[PDB]
Design a protein around this ligand. Structure first.
Ligand SMILES: O=C(c1ccc(-n2nc(C(F)(F)F)c3c2CCCC3)cc1)N1CCCC1
Ligand SMILES: N[C@@H](CCC(=O)O)C(=O)O
Ligand SMILES: N[C@@H](CCC(=O)O)C(=O)O
Ligand SMILES: [Zn+2]
Ligand SMILES: [Zn+2]
Lengths: 260, 262
């Protein structure tokens, strides 16, 4: 009976540092959707755990030259952590090297603009140059554009891969800050979950425009063949059926909304 | 062993699997059309197998009898070795997951409310509070079970009503429920998955609609018998087809491109 090392990532409102965190220790420093979900998963599977924030601050991508994985994915693949409880997107390239539970949350890539920016769709972003746009580094959104053979998205990638200065950001907070200070000349492509949360926070100057560009899910990840996987998957399905996932989403998005 | 034809269990449920107009003069898989017919072809291509579509004998999705403990429906067909895979609008649930394997979901849905247009109902809450408008579910599936197991006040209360209502508010098929919404002049509302509600909303005579939010959020998965050698490849195939755009193209094809109500 070992303490399970949980890798996760600081990403609002999934895992955030509490306001008084420097006077707090271990798991108690953090709050958020995935902090509550970790507690619930651990209860139903019956383990003790330690939240650890991923060292390199990344979700996970595979370097094309070395084939080495970074981020939470790489922590699971190289045996640093036992489980990933995070907004980690289920993808085919990841599923090849790690296991995922059934999804605990739905999402899709979406567009974030500063309010009043004259963009309504991906198609709109793609037909112009005045408004720059990009995605997070080392995540599933960047890859979706990398891999897309849909004309509008292919054309969006061609611009993004070569744009100068770089349109890509290391963190969601960086991308969001860029939107907010670019006076409508930078739009950010990010997952609808993160977009809708931000929209409901002060200074209330961003919005999600248009529909989602895809539809997919976050799952709880474990190293390939790990013994936790079966229990974690049953636990996710249980929490889904009890209504707890829905309770948590409302708690962290809509109950803590501050743009009325 | 040498490669066997994969027996696929599915269910006649529009627009997932339907009989082609001219089915009597065709053979085998060519008799059927729809979303799950198209999806089966693709899953099979990408996993490298031959398959035979078969409609489940009892016309049911799958539930376990409380007394006999026997699983019926598509789930029965996989549990008892009569099929190798189910490709259908079969909901991923915990009880099912304990006896069969599911791929990651291929399509997202939630329980929702179907009314005849002009029915004075806007929510589950509305339905729970009142009595002139009867409501029920498909008599053997994930939706009925959702209500039988829910701890949420409005839904417990809905169940308490539905289980004891007479005449029965439960129906044998989705088509029966829709026919009942349509014939009951606003006095019956039907609780069914959003996907099916959304489809019917786009069909002549265009007299129904989905109202309110969805009551839950889940998915349909491709099912295999627990531990089957297909599970892995089918799962990777679902993910590839999601990431390429195929699932979205198929939903658009079968729901919206062929809609009859604008
Ligand atoms: O409401 C959902 C839900 C259901 C299904 C999905 N997922 N997840 C995936 C994928 F596995 F990521 F690819 C796909 C879908 C639907 C679209 C096809 C691919 C996403 C979210 N839940 C909330 C709690 C349980 C699942
Ligand atoms: N959820 C993403 C990170 C955010 C994004 O890529 O937009 C991932 O698992 O890689
Ligand atoms: N998709 C459901 C059947 C339809 C319903 O229950 O509303 C099942 O797998 O049981
Ligand atoms: Zn619990
Ligand atoms: Zn490199």
């Amino acid at each position: 009976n070992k303490t399970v090392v949980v890798t996760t990532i600081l990403e609002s409102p999934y895992v955030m540092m509490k306001k008084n965190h420097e006077m707090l220790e271990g798991n108690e420093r953090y709050e958020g959707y995935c902090v509550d979900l970790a507690a619930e998963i651990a209860k139903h599977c019956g383990f003790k755990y330690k939240l650890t924030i991923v060292g390199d601050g990344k979700y996970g991508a595979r370097d094309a030259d070395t084939k080495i994985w970074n981020g939470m994915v790489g922590e699971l693949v190289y045996g640093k952590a036992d489980i990933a409880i995070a907004p980690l997107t289920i993808t085919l390239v990841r599923e090849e090297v790690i296991d995922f539970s059934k999804p605990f949350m739905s999402l899709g890539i979406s567009i974030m603009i500063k309010k009043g920016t004259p963009i309504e769709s991906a198609e709109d972003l793609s037909k112009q140059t005045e408004i720059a746009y990009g995605t997070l580094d080392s995540g599933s959104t960047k890859e979706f554009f990398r891999r897309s053979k849909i004309a509008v998205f292919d054309k969006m990638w061609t611009y993004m891969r070569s744009a100068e200065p770089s349109v890509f950001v290391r963190t969601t907070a960086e991308g969001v800050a860029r939107v907010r200070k670019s006076k409508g000349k930078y739009a950010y492509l990010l997952e609808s979950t993160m977009n809708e949360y931000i929209e409901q926070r002060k200074p209330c100057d961003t919005m999600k425009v248009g529909g989602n560009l895809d539809s997919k899910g976050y799952g709880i990840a474990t190293p390939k063949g790990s013994s936790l996987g079966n229990a974690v998957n049953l636990a996710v399905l249980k929490l889904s059926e009890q209504g707890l996932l829905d309770k948590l989403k409302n708690k962290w998005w809509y109950d803590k909304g501050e743009c009325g």
